[PDB]
Amino acid sequence: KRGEIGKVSGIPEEHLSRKVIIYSPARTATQSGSGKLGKWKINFVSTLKWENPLMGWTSTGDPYANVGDSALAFDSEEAAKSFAERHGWDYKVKKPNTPLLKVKSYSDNFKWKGNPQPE
Amino acid sequence: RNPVGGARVHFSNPEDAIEVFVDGYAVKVPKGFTVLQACEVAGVDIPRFCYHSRLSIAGNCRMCLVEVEKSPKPVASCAMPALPGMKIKTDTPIAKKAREGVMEFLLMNHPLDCPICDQGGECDLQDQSMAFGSDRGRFTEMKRSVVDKNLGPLVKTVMTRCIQCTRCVRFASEVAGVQDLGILGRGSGEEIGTYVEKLMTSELSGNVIDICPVGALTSKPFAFKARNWE
Amino acid sequence: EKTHFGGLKDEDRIFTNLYGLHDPFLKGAMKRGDWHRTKDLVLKGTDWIVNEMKKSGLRGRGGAGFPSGLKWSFMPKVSDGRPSYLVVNADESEPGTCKDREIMRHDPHKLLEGCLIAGVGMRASAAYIYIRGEYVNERLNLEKARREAYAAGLLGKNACGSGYDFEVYIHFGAGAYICGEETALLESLEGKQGKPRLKPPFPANAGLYGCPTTVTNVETVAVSPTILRRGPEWFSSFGRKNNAGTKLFCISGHVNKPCTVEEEMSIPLKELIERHCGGVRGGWDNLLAIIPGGSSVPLIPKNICEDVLMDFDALKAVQSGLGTAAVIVMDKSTDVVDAIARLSYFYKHESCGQCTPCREGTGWLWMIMERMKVGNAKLEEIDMLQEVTKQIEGHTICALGDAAAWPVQGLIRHFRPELERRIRERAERELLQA
Amino acid sequence: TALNYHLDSPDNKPDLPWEFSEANQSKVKEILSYYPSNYKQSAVIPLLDLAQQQNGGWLPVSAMNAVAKVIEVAPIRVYEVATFYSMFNRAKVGKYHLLVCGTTPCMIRGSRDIESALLDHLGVKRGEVTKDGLFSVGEMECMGCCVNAPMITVADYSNGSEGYTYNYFEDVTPEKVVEIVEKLRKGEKPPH
Amino acid sequence: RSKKSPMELISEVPPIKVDGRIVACEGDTNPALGHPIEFICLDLNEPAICKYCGLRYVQDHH
Amino acid sequence: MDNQFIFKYSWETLPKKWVKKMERSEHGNRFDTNTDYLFQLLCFLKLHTYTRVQVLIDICGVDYPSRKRRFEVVYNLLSTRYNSRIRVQTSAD
Ligand SMILES: Cc1cc2nc3c(=O)[nH]c(=O)nc-3n(C[C@H](O)[C@H](O)[C@H](O)COP(=O)(O)O)c2cc1C
Ligand code: SF4
Ligand code: SF4
Ligand code: SF4
Ligand code: FES
Ligand code: FES
Ligand SMILES: [Zn+2]
């Protein structure tokens, strides 16, 4: 809806109907730092990537292969939604999963373990 | 400020919320919430090697040290419970020189096999060394070494590059539910292993690959296949 | 007096039979004043014992220095289902100290009386004595004494004829220096590796088996019964303000006939060395260095060991505290760098490798000081050693890291010029031979 | 030769059956009785020491599993305990385990002089048993005030859990230590 | 010769004899022109293979 | 002229409604003005006696795809006589 900016962008018209996914990438499991969170990106699904039959190089024909990764990063969900809405893409927002901080204490390691009652 | 990583704080008791000063910015946290978690609430990210939010708290590796105004020694923020009205200090010369001093000890016996480490691009040791570390490097003598003992067809182990953070041991003892991995020895030269020929036979036994920060435990099927950036 | 706190009359001493001149079993202890109407002593209740201990000013031995009254008062007054325990730190590691094995070899019933008195003054259902693993004969003798006391109704249910119940068990380690720590003691006694736990979970709230407990030295509890019987006011007379009492000194080193006598608290070092244990070998003229107390404290050179008082605060003001009170003197005939290097190797050997600064820092200290023992290092390595010791100190879990950093700092502060001398002479040799 | 891994050997392997002796069973029960029933893991140190005494001075992997079954814990939790403490040998030692000079309170007085005599009188390196399984040389820790720099230490593993004895000898001499070795060769014990 | 790939060509080099618990491998005799130094604990009876070079080190003693 | 002197004088001399946002630092004096006052501000900076900005270095442009005014055109200027460098930037769409 409201693809006027999409119309005036000048990009090929056939790429204005692409379905896109909006999400905030989660923290990687292999690292414990949280310096790569809170930034939203549009995920064009550049699925088609065949293999060059000369050297095994990965060829592609999708112009949006790495745009959403290398560039085009948004500081908020609203900005990304407004951007996709302005360019007339059928976006689909995926809310991120956030950790739930729980009361954790060192002393919980060392519990009385009850009373040696017969059982 | 907003919590780092979007972490949600669940106040099971609205009345009990002690107010602390992480770096001069007062925040409210419930009972418990060790100094590390209080800083996590206030948007401050503290280095950590032994502390996993899913396992029991251990105090080794002394990397999350911070300075408290009413404390002579730097305290382990990952273990010291929060108290009302603390004046915590993170960006302080004491709390910094603590971190470089600890990480120098961490790196003094680490092997020089970064180009062949399967966790080269996503290692917490080097990523934190670039930020919270001194660039010079002072150690010059001979390092130690540990031989590699096979365990499992899908967990490739190089225990030479293993900081003894005991995270794998706690995971195997608590989450996995099978007690096969333990810490053996005393002093400089303690090893971690099964002490026998047994392999890790558990359904969720492949999670030791991610939970171990350094490249000591890495997946065997993914041995040297690709780097994280590609 | 106040002018000089030196010399006991040999009848004011409380550790009789210290030389093993008489029987150490129940009969000898009974004839020497043990198990003397202890039921009357325990029937005044817990509060009276704690108040008397506070009045007596009994500073905790074993190197901690914490007052015993304050430590005992920390135990809870009401039992919330969890019984309270008592652990006696009989692990006499850190060699050069032989006072605890002498106490348990010759005065076992005194230790049993002290532990019972402590368990009356702290609401402890049972008490555990953790004997060092190497003390096999001592453990067997103390077990015999314990069963002798049990057969006499002195322990067990209805202890000493009163309504109080006390069970005394025996546990022995397997040769680990770190097991002597306050918390690694409880970890080992719980059935796992002896690695210390973090401090904020204090043993007064979660100790042995997750139950509140208090750890006290065997020497500190052995003086508990005699203090109450002889009166707290009498005990406070020996020494000076807030740190009075009688301390056992295990003198050793380059001296002739080293003794292990018990004397006053604020004993002058010169008087103690030159009165009991003859004199330092070669005379006082050499007196290269001396470690006051155990080896876990910084060294004191020749200049500042004169007119020094063997008190906790008096020594602490000299940046070298008093630990187990077993001095090791060094004559000028021997080098000081080699002894400290061997001490650093010992600290590297016994470190339980839990936290990073102690696990790696002690090894680094050993390597650096082995290198400089032959002088094979640059001149700037001394400041590097100082910085490494500063990094190790204060960032560890237990006090062994500080106990390993302190001797190096003591050597550097007082005996630095020897290091430059060795380094320079080795440099001259290297340039002379090609 | 202190290692933290097994590499199964025909002398010690997990499949071998190890059981506490009938005389030692009463001692096992007495040891277990000193601790609450739910906290049976606390008896690991006394049980391991008793098992080492019974076997003859060394702790095989099967004895560790037997102790683990006795206290009902995972066998790794007993491997950790056995490896941590410097009193469980985990490697075969002859009937007598000689212990050699100690640390720096003693090395100040010249501890490290009496080390080669014990080795060349039997022709075996440290940690290696003689041709017959009687003597071995290992390291020790000083009990305390080590005024006599040359000391030796013996462990009577010949009789087993019954005649086990751990004595410390003071003021040892290179010919005196040979005299003690010969005295222990026939069977009689020296005076301490 | 070129019919022998490094896979089957590095295995024909006999293992190095060295005393001690560990050995430092640098690749070339000049440290700057080799690989990063790699201390390996050669305690197992199998030769310990350097991860960079592929050279095998075995303990002469025992 | 000194960088802080340009700061003080220009901020005092300029009409207040022209400059929405302005910044002083070692990197460079910045005048973030509105999109319609840009011509007038440039004319004032070109002709005023104390601030004689005679040469325009370049007209830049930065794309911020996260704000309502996506683009931002930057005008780098130079005063040859007084040896100063001023930077004026606005927001576009
Ligand atoms: C590394 C370390 C080793 C220790 N070893 C002993 C020891 O062998 N014997 C002892 O009585 N105290 C030792 N201590 C001091 C203990 O903390 C002490 O036994 C305990 O705190 C009781 O002290 P108290 O007698 O003042 O109550 C050691 C402390 C540390 C940090
Ligand atoms: S674990 Fe990290 S620091 Fe160690 S070699 Fe691998 S990438 Fe380098
Ligand atoms: S193997 Fe990994 S998880 Fe386990 S202690 Fe070593 S670094 Fe930590
Ligand atoms: S400082 Fe040393 S002895 Fe103390 S807990 Fe840490 S590693 Fe163990
Ligand atoms: S991360 Fe907290 S002490 Fe290791
Ligand atoms: S430790 Fe060997 S003489 Fe005392
Ligand atoms: Zn190599």
Side-chain angles (χ1 to χ4, degrees):
Chain A
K1 69 189 176 304
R2 197 207 211 188
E4 42 198 3
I5 303 307
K7 291 296 190 292
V8 298
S9 43
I11 62 170
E13 61 206 80
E14 65 183 1
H15 293 111
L16 277 298
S17 55
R18 183 160 301 211
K19 309 256 174 303
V20 307
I21 307 163
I22 293 175
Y23 64 73
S24 172
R27 194 209 68 198
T28 186
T30 57
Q31 291 202 66
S32 179
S34 297
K36 289 284 290 298
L37 294 174
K39 284 262 171 303
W40 295 71
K41 321 189 316 304
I42 297 169
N43 186 6
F44 318 90
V45 287
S46 182
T47 314
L48 179 66
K49 296 173 186 184
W50 65 97
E51 211 196 0
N52 184 30
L54 180 65
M55 302 278 296
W57 299 341
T58 306
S59 297
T60 199
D62 190 350
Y64 292 113
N66 47 66
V67 176
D69 291 331
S70 51
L72 189 64
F74 309 90
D75 288 20
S76 57
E77 154 188 41
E78 311 274 40
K81 262 151 55 181
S82 73
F83 207 93
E85 190 276 331
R86 280 210 277 97
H87 284 54
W89 282 318
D90 313 328
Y91 63 106
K92 192 193 87 66
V93 179
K94 273 163 151 263
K95 307 283 181 233
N97 298 315
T98 53
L100 183 63
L101 290 175
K102 285 223 161 303
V103 184
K104 189 184 293 295
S105 63
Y106 182 80
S107 65
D108 282 8
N109 290 318
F110 292 163
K111 299 300 289 294
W112 180 29
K113 206 183 284 189
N115 197 0
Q117 57 87 31
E119 200 52 47
Chain B
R1 282 88 174 92
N2 43 26
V4 59
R8 318 185 315 255
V9 181
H10 193 227
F11 284 92
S12 290
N13 201 342
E15 291 56 70
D16 201 338
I18 62 170
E19 183 178 1
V20 300
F21 298 89
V22 296
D23 216 6
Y25 182 76
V27 287
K28 333 175 163 178
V29 287
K31 199 51 62 171
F33 275 18
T34 71
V35 178
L36 191 139
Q37 276 168 308
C39 297
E40 296 294 327
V41 169
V44 184
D45 191 73
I46 287 177
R48 60 183 68 79
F49 273 115
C50 70
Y51 172 72
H52 200 278
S53 56
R54 298 291 184 269
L55 317 168
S56 44
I57 286 177
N60 45 8
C61 70
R62 312 307 286 174
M63 185 81 191
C64 63
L65 292 181
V66 297
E67 181 46 3
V68 174
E69 284 211 311
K70 286 325 186 303
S71 296
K73 292 170 54 180
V75 299
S77 54
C78 83
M80 183 177 177
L83 285 192
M86 294 183 286
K87 297 277 276 292
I88 312 154
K89 293 263 190 262
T90 67
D91 213 318
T92 300
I94 301 310
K96 271 158 81 171
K97 303 332 161 173
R99 294 204 202 107
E100 292 84 4
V102 164
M103 182 95 97
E104 183 178 1
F105 291 138
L106 282 170
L107 288 195
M108 72 167 255
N109 280 318
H110 210 69
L112 275 160
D113 47 45
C114 279
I116 55 176
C117 193
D118 211 2
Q119 201 165 4
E122 79 206 357
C123 184
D124 276 332
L125 189 39
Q126 79 180 16
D127 276 4
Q128 290 185 21
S129 171
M130 281 294 280
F132 318 107
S134 292
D135 48 354
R136 194 41 41 181
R138 277 202 283 250
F139 192 76
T140 61
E141 292 89 62
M142 202 156 287
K143 317 183 173 215
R144 64 150 171 79
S145 288
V146 176
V147 77
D148 312 334
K149 287 319 287 171
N150 185 3
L151 77 166
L154 61 83
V155 177
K156 174 189 205 295
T157 182
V158 180
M159 290 295 178
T160 311
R161 61 178 77 100
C162 169
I163 57 171
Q164 282 89 4
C165 71
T166 76
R167 204 187 278 188
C168 63
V169 167
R170 305 193 310 259
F171 171 87
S173 175
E174 297 165 21
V175 178
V178 58
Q179 313 202 1
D180 46 27
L181 213 54
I183 190 167
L184 310 170
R186 184 179 67 189
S188 179
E190 62 167 9
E191 310 197 28
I192 282 178
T194 61
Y195 191 73
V196 285
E197 201 265 350
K198 71 171 72 174
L199 324 180
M200 294 182 286
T201 61
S202 177
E203 68 274 15
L204 72 165
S205 74
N207 296 278
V208 294
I209 306 304
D210 315 290
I211 191 167
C212 169
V214 299
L217 292 184
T218 60
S219 55
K220 197 170 278 170
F222 198 68
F224 322 130
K225 284 273 186 176
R227 290 283 207 194
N228 68 346
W229 55 72
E230 56 186 73
Chain C
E1 294 85 4
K2 314 302 291 303
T3 178
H4 51 57
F5 313 94
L8 294 174
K9 284 90 184 153
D10 218 335
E11 71 255 10
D12 287 328
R13 323 213 305 181
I14 62 192
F15 283 109
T16 53
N17 196 85
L18 193 144
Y19 283 100
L21 312 182
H22 294 89
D23 163 80
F25 288 138
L26 186 44
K27 275 75 67 179
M30 281 284 247
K31 297 329 185 62
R32 283 192 291 272
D34 278 10
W35 306 106
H36 187 193
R37 65 169 75 80
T38 60
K39 178 180 43 59
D40 292 24
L41 201 43
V42 306
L43 274 171
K44 271 79 73 176
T46 289
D47 291 328
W48 180 68
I49 293 173
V50 176
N51 289 119
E52 291 272 88
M53 277 286 162
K54 280 157 150 277
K55 209 175 314 169
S56 56
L58 174 58
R59 303 272 312 256
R61 281 86 171 92
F66 209 58
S68 286
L70 277 78
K71 181 185 264 277
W72 285 24
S73 67
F74 278 150
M75 301 275 298
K77 305 319 297 152
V78 58
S79 69
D80 47 353
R82 293 182 318 161
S84 309
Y85 287 105
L86 194 146
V87 184
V88 185
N89 197 24
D91 186 74
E92 182 58 340
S93 185
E94 189 183 3
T97 62
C98 56
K99 59 168 175 65
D100 292 331
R101 92 166 148 84
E102 280 319 277
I103 280 177
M104 65 184 73
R105 259 185 64 193
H106 312 312
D107 299 322
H109 283 280
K110 188 172 286 184
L111 170 54
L112 271 298
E113 186 159 293
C115 85
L116 167 77
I117 289 300
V120 173
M122 293 181 285
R123 266 73 175 265
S125 49
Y128 290 89
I129 307 173
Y130 174 90
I131 306 143
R132 178 185 174 171
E134 280 98 16
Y135 301 160
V136 167
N137 307 316
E138 290 75 1
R139 162 159 59 78
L140 294 179
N141 176 32
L142 193 151
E143 279 202 318
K144 273 211 290 283
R146 161 177 166 273
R147 74 178 61 258
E148 282 183 0
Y150 263 101
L154 302 170
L155 295 164
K157 305 195 315 306
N158 200 294
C160 289
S162 59
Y164 214 81
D165 287 350
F166 212 60
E167 311 255 10
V168 170
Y169 307 111
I170 286 308
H171 192 88
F172 59 99
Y177 168 51
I178 192 49
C179 275
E181 207 267 340
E182 158 189 32
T183 303
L185 183 56
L186 321 179
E187 300 286 328
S188 159
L189 184 56
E190 274 186 47
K192 44 181 61 63
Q193 312 198 298
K195 312 208 171 178
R197 95 189 62 175
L198 271 294
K199 185 57 70 176
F202 291 101
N205 303 335
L208 190 62
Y209 298 139
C211 309
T213 190
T214 294
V215 176
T216 43
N217 194 8
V218 58
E219 205 279 337
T220 309
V221 292
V223 302
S224 190
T226 183
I227 275 171
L228 292 182
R229 274 206 297 271
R230 199 162 296 181
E233 272 291 349
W234 168 89
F235 192 74
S236 179
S237 52
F238 293 99
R240 65 176 194 172
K241 46 204 173 64
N242 75 37
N243 41 38
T246 62
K247 189 81 188 72
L248 276 77
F249 291 88
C250 167
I251 320 295
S252 175
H254 301 99
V255 293
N256 46 7
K257 193 212 60 158
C259 290
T260 186
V261 301
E262 168 192 1
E263 294 294 328
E264 309 182 31
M265 187 66 204
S266 176
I267 292 281
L269 183 63
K270 256 195 174 56
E271 184 84 56
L272 183 63
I273 280 165
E274 297 181 355
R275 193 176 183 183
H276 292 269
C277 302
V280 288
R281 208 170 53 141
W284 195 268
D285 46 13
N286 319 120
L287 174 83
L288 163 78
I290 174 177
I291 297 170
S295 79
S296 66
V297 303
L299 183 62
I300 286 180
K302 181 204 191 309
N303 188 2
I304 62 170
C305 46
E306 65 183 1
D307 312 328
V308 70
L309 278 297
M310 282 306 249
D311 191 76
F312 282 111
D313 306 325
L315 271 168
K316 186 196 49 205
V318 185
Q319 294 139 342
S320 168
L322 180 65
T324 42
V327 309
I328 303 295
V329 305
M330 299 146 197
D331 55 351
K332 205 176 296 302
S333 175
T334 190
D335 62 358
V336 67
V337 186
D338 208 356
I340 301 290
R342 297 190 295 260
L343 202 55
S344 189
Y345 172 76
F346 162 65
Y347 282 113
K348 188 260 285 184
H349 191 242
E350 312 294 30
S351 70
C352 82
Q354 192 197 16
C355 58
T356 285
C358 180
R359 179 174 73 243
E360 311 285 20
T362 57
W364 200 4
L365 289 185
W366 176 63
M367 291 185 108
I368 297 169
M369 185 179 288
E370 284 288 332
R371 284 208 330 177
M372 294 183 286
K373 182 175 73 175
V374 292
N376 193 336
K378 324 191 314 303
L379 188 153
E380 277 70 24
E381 304 302 273
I382 305 176
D383 315 327
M384 201 265 267
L385 200 50
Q386 182 63 255
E387 271 195 20
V388 167
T389 53
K390 272 322 191 187
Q391 272 160 223
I392 299 172
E393 198 174 4
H395 306 78
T396 63
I397 283 189
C398 80
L400 196 145
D402 307 342
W406 283 349
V408 177
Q409 291 190 306
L411 175 139
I412 278 172
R413 198 170 53 238
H414 299 300
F415 293 98
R416 183 173 176 176
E418 166 87 14
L419 292 163
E420 286 88 4
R421 168 198 85 78
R422 293 160 155 278
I423 290 179
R424 284 193 266 92
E425 74 179 1
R426 187 185 168 82
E428 310 206 40
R429 280 188 307 263
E430 204 74 39
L431 64 87
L432 196 142
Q433 282 92 20
Chain D
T1 306
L3 270 59
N4 313 269
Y5 53 80
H6 196 215
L7 259 67
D8 294 336
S9 181
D11 194 8
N12 48 0
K13 62 182 73 174
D15 73 40
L16 297 182
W18 198 92
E19 271 314 326
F20 267 98
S21 287
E22 311 313 345
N24 274 357
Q25 280 267 15
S26 66
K27 292 177 71 67
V28 162
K29 294 180 176 66
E30 261 291 342
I31 287 181
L32 287 171
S33 76
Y34 293 168
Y35 318 102
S37 298
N38 49 4
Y39 283 107
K40 273 189 292 292
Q41 189 180 342
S42 188
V44 55
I45 301 299
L47 269 168
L48 276 181
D49 189 358
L50 174 60
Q52 161 163 284
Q53 293 172 11
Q54 156 176 343
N55 192 31
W58 75 306
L59 194 62
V61 74
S62 65
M64 292 165 171
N65 306 334
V67 174
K69 282 187 65 184
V70 162
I71 62 170
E72 294 177 354
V73 303
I76 180 57
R77 304 271 97 77
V78 186
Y79 302 157
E80 297 192 306
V81 159
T83 312
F84 180 78
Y85 295 106
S86 58
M87 192 145 288
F88 311 139
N89 288 305
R90 318 198 316 284
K92 71 180 298 294
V93 173
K95 295 298 180 186
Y96 284 169
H97 191 214
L98 274 299
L99 263 53
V100 66
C101 67
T103 179
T104 187
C106 183
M107 293 183 286
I108 283 170
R109 293 178 183 269
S111 194
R112 42 186 58 187
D113 51 357
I114 190 167
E115 191 276 331
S116 64
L118 281 293
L119 188 153
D120 44 18
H121 189 267
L122 322 171
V124 288
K125 202 62 207 71
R126 293 219 297 217
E128 173 96 342
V129 185
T130 67
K131 183 179 80 171
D132 193 358
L134 274 297
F135 314 79
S136 302
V137 179
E139 301 66 20
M140 82 197 174
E141 304 297 330
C142 280
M143 65 214 99
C145 50
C146 47
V147 285
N148 312 83
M151 294 183 286
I152 193 66
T153 295
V154 308
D156 186 74
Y157 295 127
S158 69
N159 189 359
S161 66
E162 284 270 37
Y164 170 77
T165 302
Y166 203 102
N167 300 329
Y168 264 81
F169 301 109
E170 53 95 19
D171 200 333
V172 183
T173 301
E175 71 265 350
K176 268 180 55 67
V177 73
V178 170
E179 183 178 1
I180 317 184
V181 168
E182 191 270 298
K183 190 177 291 293
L184 285 188
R185 260 199 201 280
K186 56 163 293 314
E188 64 184 2
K189 56 181 70 65
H192 66 99
Chain E
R1 85 207 45 179
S2 171
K3 310 317 290 172
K4 292 292 189 281
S5 75
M7 198 265 268
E8 75 259 18
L9 191 151
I10 196 58
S11 279
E12 319 181 322
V13 188
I16 301 299
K17 285 318 201 154
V18 65
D19 53 347
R21 285 265 282 258
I22 63 170
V23 65
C25 194
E26 293 179 353
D28 186 74
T29 181
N30 189 359
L33 312 180
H35 63 79
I37 191 167
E38 186 72 26
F39 309 93
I40 62 170
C41 197
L42 72 165
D43 270 359
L44 294 174
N45 50 4
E46 293 83 3
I49 309 168
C50 169
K51 303 222 174 75
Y52 286 88
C53 317
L55 280 189
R56 316 199 302 282
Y57 296 79
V58 68
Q59 218 181 5
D60 57 349
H61 283 348
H62 299 285
Chain F
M1 294 182 286
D2 203 358
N3 194 6
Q4 63 174 0
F5 182 76
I6 300 298
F7 161 78
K8 293 187 286 185
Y9 179 80
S10 284
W11 190 65
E12 293 201 4
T13 303
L14 282 195
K16 304 311 296 211
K17 53 185 219 199
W18 279 352
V19 296
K20 172 178 71 176
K21 181 186 176 75
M22 61 80 71
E23 175 160 24
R24 181 179 76 86
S25 58
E26 285 266 279
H27 295 162
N29 215 57
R30 191 216 293 204
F31 283 163
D32 195 313
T33 180
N34 278 311
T35 184
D36 73 17
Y37 294 130
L38 183 63
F39 189 98
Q40 287 91 40
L41 173 52
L42 265 290
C43 202
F44 187 98
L45 288 172
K46 184 175 158 33
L47 299 173
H48 191 30
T49 294
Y50 288 171
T51 70
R52 267 202 85 77
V53 164
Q54 286 143 300
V55 61
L56 180 139
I57 289 308
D58 81 11
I59 297 169
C60 182
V62 184
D63 180 311
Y64 291 105
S66 159
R67 66 184 68 187
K68 184 222 171 303
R69 326 297 305 271
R70 185 180 172 179
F71 312 114
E72 180 166 6
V73 293
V74 180
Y75 293 73
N76 285 288
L77 302 165
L78 167 77
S79 190
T80 294
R81 193 210 173 75
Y82 296 110
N83 201 348
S84 66
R85 203 175 287 257
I86 190 81
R87 180 206 310 167
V88 184
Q89 44 188 89
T90 61
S91 297
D93 214 18

